[PDB]
Structure 1
Amino acid sequence: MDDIYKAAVEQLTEEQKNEFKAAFDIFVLGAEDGCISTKELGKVMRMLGQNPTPEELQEMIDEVDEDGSGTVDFDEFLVMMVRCMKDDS
């Protein structure tokens, strides 16, 4: 975990986390603690306007997950987005 991605999540604009913060609450609307589970991620992205595959959902998530929790919180949830936004070198 270098200091490159950490800045990628902060570089986001205030309007980016403002609108996404709303949808995020839509996936946790069913969760028990208030987080977006990877199981619904597919439906979460399908309506968000994305087209993630079934093997990429958990894969990418389990890859960006650092607290070894399994659910995608605003912390890992954002890193998973900036990832598909900026990949490769």
Structure 2
Amino acid sequence: MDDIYKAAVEQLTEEQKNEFKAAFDIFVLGAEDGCISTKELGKVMRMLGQNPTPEELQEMIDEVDEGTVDFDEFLVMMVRCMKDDS
């Protein structure tokens, strides 16, 4: 696991990770695909209750990405987004 990610991901409980994975899995054919599209990214985040803004999604893509998002990148983006609730 990339070490920066390791402590965004330490904010999440095992149960949150499992829930997040079940949503993510809806948007891939997991038997052959490990990434969702950048278009799908906001859809999975909204499925999980987050409401990222269009400028934010591009920003997270620029800052987190290693047009695609895999599961650990997705976890980091969820953790970032969870911190902008009001």
TM over 0.5: yes
Whether the aligned pair in 2 keeps the contact of 1:42 and 1:57 (CA below 8 Å) is: yes
Whether contact under 8 Å (1:27, 1:36) holds in the other structure is yes
If the length of structure 1 is used for normalisation, what is the TM-score?
Answer: 0.70
Does the CA contact (< 8 Å) of 1:36 and 1:73 recur in 2? yes
Distance in 1 separating the partners of 2:2 and 2:25: 29
> Percent identity at matched positions?
100
SS of corresponding position for 2:85: coil
Deviations 1:17-62 (A, max 9, x none): 1111111111224997231211122332333222111222232122
Relative to structure 1, the CA distance from residue 46 to residue 82 in structure 2 (aligned partners, 3 Å threshold; closer, same or farther) is closer
The change in CA–CA distance for 1:9 and 1:37 in structure 2 (over 3 A counts) is same
Q: Give structure 1 regions of 4+ aligned residues with deviation exceeding 6 angstroms.
A: none
Higher radius of gyration, 1 or 2: 1
Give 1 or 2: higher strand fraction.
2
The alignment covers a number of residue pairs equal to 86
List gaps (5 residues or longer) in structure 1. Answer: none
How far off its partner does 1:71 sit? 1.3
1:86 aligns with 2:58: no
Normalising by structure 2, we get a TM-score of 0.72
The answer (yes or no) to whether the contact 2:5–2:72 under 8 Å persists in 1 is no
CA RMSD of aligned residues (A): 3.8
Moved more, 29-38 or 71-80: 29-38
Gaps of at least 5 residues in structure 2 are: none
Does residue 56 (structure 1) correspond to residue 38 (structure 2)? The answer is no
